[PDB]
Specification:
One of its GO terms (cellular component) is transcription factor TFIID complex. The chain is α+β, with helices and mostly antiparallel strands. It is about 25% helix and about 35% strand. The chain binds one DNA strand through β1, β4, β5, β6 and β9.
DNA sequence: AGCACGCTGTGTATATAATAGCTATGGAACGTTCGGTTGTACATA
């Protein structure tokens, strides 16, 4: 009905290697590594070809983020593991689970936020002197939507690409019902 | 050099994994500092 498909903007994927790393060694022998143990307990590393960031912890756990596609995250995570391998550490690609997907879109018309905040009060929270966007907590699929007056919708919380589409197709009608003017 | 205006970073809201470090918060204990004369017998000269 809508005819517009939301576009994914970020994918937070987590990977494990099953081995203990020495963060200082990784920071000193990796191209772009930023290890500051005083603030955080991981070495932050970036690569350019998929443009993703990785938080590599001392327990062999990795948190890749920034990929725009489900497969691109796999390529980024694989390259990060390979870089760790080329250092010499025992690193093997292992369980890869996408823990969060963020998508954005626009319905192309203003939305009366005061309406959703009133009609849908059990899901929507509208406190406009803190954040200019209404927060809709959909119950099935369990996804959080940020609805803005300019007609822009942000989808976050989906674990697969299907739920983020399902949420938008279920939110378009109630959004159109509250079109200003 | 002070005032108006543009640009840029910071905060606030949402989801999520990972980790280590500090904070509350009850529960238990120990140490220091406040609220004779009188009168009658008796035995002997």
């Amino acid at each position: 009905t809508s005819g517009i498909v939301p576009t994914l903007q970020n994918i937070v994927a987590t990977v494990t290697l099953g081995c203990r790393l020495d963060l200082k060694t990784v920071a000193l022998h990796a191209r772009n590594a930023e290890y500051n143990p005083k603030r955080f307990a991981a070495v932050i590393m970036r690569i350019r070809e998929p443009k993703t960031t990785a938080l590599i912890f001392a327990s062999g756990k990795m948190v890749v983020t920034g990929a725009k596609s489900e497969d691109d995250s796999k390529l980024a995570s694989r390259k990060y593991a390979r870089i760790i391998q080329k250092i010499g550490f025992a690193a093997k690609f292992t369980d890869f689970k996408i823990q969060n997907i963020v998508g954005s879109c626009d319905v192309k018309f203003p939305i009366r936020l005061e309406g959703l905040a009133f009609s849908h009060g059990t899901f929507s929270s509208y406190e406009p002197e803190l954040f200019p966007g209404l927060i809709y907590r959909m119950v099935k699929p369990k996804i959080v939507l940020l609805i803005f007056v300019s007609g822009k919708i942000v989808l976050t919380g989906a674990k697969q690409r299907e739920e983020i589409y399902q949420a938008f197709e279920a939110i378009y009608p109630v959004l159109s019902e509250f079109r200003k003017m």
